[PDB]
Amino acid sequence: SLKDMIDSIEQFAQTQADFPVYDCLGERRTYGQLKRDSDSIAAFIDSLALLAKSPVLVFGAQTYDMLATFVALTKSGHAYIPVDVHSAPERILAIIEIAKPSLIIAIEEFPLTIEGISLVSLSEIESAKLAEMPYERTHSVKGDDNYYIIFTSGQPKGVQISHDNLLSFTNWMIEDAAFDVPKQPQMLAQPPYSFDLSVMYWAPTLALGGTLFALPKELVADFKQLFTTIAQLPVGIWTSTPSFADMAMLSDDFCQAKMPALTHFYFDGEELTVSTARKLFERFPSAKIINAYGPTEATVALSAIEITREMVDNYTRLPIGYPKPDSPTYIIDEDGKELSSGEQGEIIVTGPAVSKGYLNNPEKTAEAFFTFKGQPAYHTGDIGSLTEDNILLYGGRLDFQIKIELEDVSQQLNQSPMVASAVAVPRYNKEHKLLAYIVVKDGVKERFDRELELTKAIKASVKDHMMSYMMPSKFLYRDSLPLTPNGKIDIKTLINEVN
């Protein structure tokens, strides 16, 4: 049972000083270096005489200095706000208005000028590391103090995760049979620090003293090379969105033979498709696949389960798994009434992993955060249900249960032997409403004179399992789907594209 994230990495600094905590295509850093580097940055932070416990915005990609800096802020009692190098300047500016950081640490070149706030760059950090100052933790973040603030993706909200929030996620994850995390795990680090899925690699990794394998900023660009460089890393564990795995599927190198070391896939953030999973079993016969689910507002994930071939062969949708023992999760009616097994309603999460709320936004906190049986609770905005087995099943976003949930129509379509992926979207006219974007498997377009014949053909492929009222009317064909900065299918965009 983990007690303090920092205490942990501090031990590994005594216990396995020269073991690698970080690797970027071969340039490595060790637990001993992480301790000294972060001790010295901490010292530099304290010398800046920032207001106690103020948050600090850390802007960069996924280099070692990002992590060293995060650890230094935690040591010196500051929550960090991670902002990725690719985020839109308006997003950055909005984040800065909401969070009112006392300092900006631009570990990559800051793309803006913001007067009124202290700004420090990479050179200051490197100069602090080079100075090797000593550090004693007198005012680290502990308990209910913010550990990090992650901004959501509408208009942005700042989710406050406390050290206690964090420990509850991490302690579950490393004790969970599904995840089954090995000692000193060797984990890919593909998700950006601005997205909370990244916690799913750095927390268990730092807690179990493994190594993070990070990729350079410019490989994020070209996908042919990306997946070829990833291929060469001795990574044991792949953590990403399912859409990112779908992209990996287009590479010859994404397979057992080229990635002999790969034992586990951890997915969160997005519906894991039956088809994606089947395909993963094609390329990695021996790999285990873990589906996990949770909102940012409850620390990364609240449930998880192993995916089997039994499930892939049989099910329409994949399960999102067993809720964690310390975070009681409930399904509720629209009236607030808890539902018995099997009925569908809003997923509600409770317990010590629930965020204390949205930084400086009490209206939105009051709307989503409430007390359920005297336990702090969060409205997920997700529809699902609970099995007798205590297994969460996913229906979809409340925003998209349009009565059925668009998500269901979508997965019923993905069942077509002709469809690569589909998304059912509605058309609006006065705030008044059934279509679907389709990408077909390759070599399908060419088998067909016109769109109508293709549409009739697709619609016949799925008819015997699709209720009549759930079959959309017009299909809109594209060659791929738009992807959000965080590796997700951009549903919002697709619904706007059809006004």
Swiss-Prot record:
Keyword tags: ATP-binding, Cytoplasm, Ligase, Nucleotide-binding
One Pfam family this sequence matches: AMP-binding
Cited InterPro entries: AA_adenyl_dom (IPR010071), AMP-bd_C (IPR025110), AMP-bd_C_sf (IPR045851), AMP-binding_CS (IPR020845), AMP-dep_synth/lig_dom (IPR000873), ANL_N_sf (IPR042099), DltA (IPR010072), DltA-like (IPR044507)
Subcellular location(s) per record: Cytoplasm
Chief location bin: cytoplasm
Keyword check for Zinc-finger: no
GO biological process, any: lipoteichoic acid biosynthetic process
Protein name: D-alanine--D-alanyl carrier protein ligase
